[PDB]
Amino acid sequence: MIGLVGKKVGMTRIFTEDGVSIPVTVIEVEANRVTQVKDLANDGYRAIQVTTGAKKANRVTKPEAGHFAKAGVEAGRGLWEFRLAEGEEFTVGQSISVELFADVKKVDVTGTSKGKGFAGTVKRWNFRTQDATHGNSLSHRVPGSIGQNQTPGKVFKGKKMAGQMGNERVTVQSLDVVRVDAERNLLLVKGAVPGATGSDLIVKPAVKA
Template sequence: MIGLVGKKLGITRIFTKDSLSIPVTLIEVLDNFVVQIKSLKTDNYESIQVTTGIKKKNNILKPEKGHFLKYKASVGRGLWEFRCKKVLRFKCGQRITINSFSNVKRVDVTGVSKGKGFSGTVKRWNFRMQDATHGNSLSHRVPGSIGQNQTPGHVFKGKKMSGHLGNTCITIQNLSIIKIDDIKKIMLIKGSIPGYVGSDIVLKPSVKEK
């Protein structure tokens, strides 16, 4: 098992037999197709390149179209790679369905988080605010001192400051699979996952599963 690519549909809740409410995220997992097989002889590493979905003809680039034609595959909405061993067990055009996760209980979910734009340190890093009164003027949400003395005389790399928040690739590990619907091709995962509704999600068997 290498992984699957799906699309986030939204979040809802389901009830157990004990009347417990569980928040779940719905992920649509259409059939994935193997496009390219990379081996040690050709690419110096082993991986499987897959695609899923359909892309509009107007949005297909010529290099992208040529890549799919080379391996005789239909053009999907993107390309994803999964590192794995024993790539010879796969074939170009092979279909990977949601049923391949039928024996998997926990997954690692990767997605691109929602972009929040330029944010200050209070929102971005959870800094505490300064006094609202007691003589404080125009310094309620400022981060405070960021520098050093004359030695070393510069701000260290990685200093928590204002900047772009979100829109980064995030992986949440060890999430439970609540249910898999083979007919509707929907997977229910416990809790929330990164990304907005309609964004692409990468699912892999959890590396921490016991």
């Protein structure tokens, strides 16, 4: 099934009458407007392109403005595509609200993880540190050996090394839906989701089920 584009508002909790505190992530899901419908005949695959939010008119380029004008919708902050499931039909200009998740139970949330910059092997790959004392010379958090000897004579591809950590697309699966509030355009899911406050999120019905 199709999903919706939302925004990470932050985390809080929901106290139940039983006395259980549920950690929840608040996702603001405003109306998603269909901008284009892909069909097998013209594009070779079935999908819908949606936009959400608003954008300053002075920031919309003429190429982008023309695209929105054909659909007849106001400009949003971006464009996202969702693959259709054959039994699903949508029209250009249609608005989809958070009511889609009324009876979904479990969702998969995709977002961009927080960026950690250049990370070492201890942090990036959970490498063990060498001895802090007992003679160690300038080698407390260094990687150690990176290969064997002459037989290979090289380092193998995929060797875990220091480098950029974070700032990448991540999907968390099978998150329980706690509350769907159409009036407030809100979706509450149990647990933490990737990204910082204010980041764009992609919510879809759970695939594993």
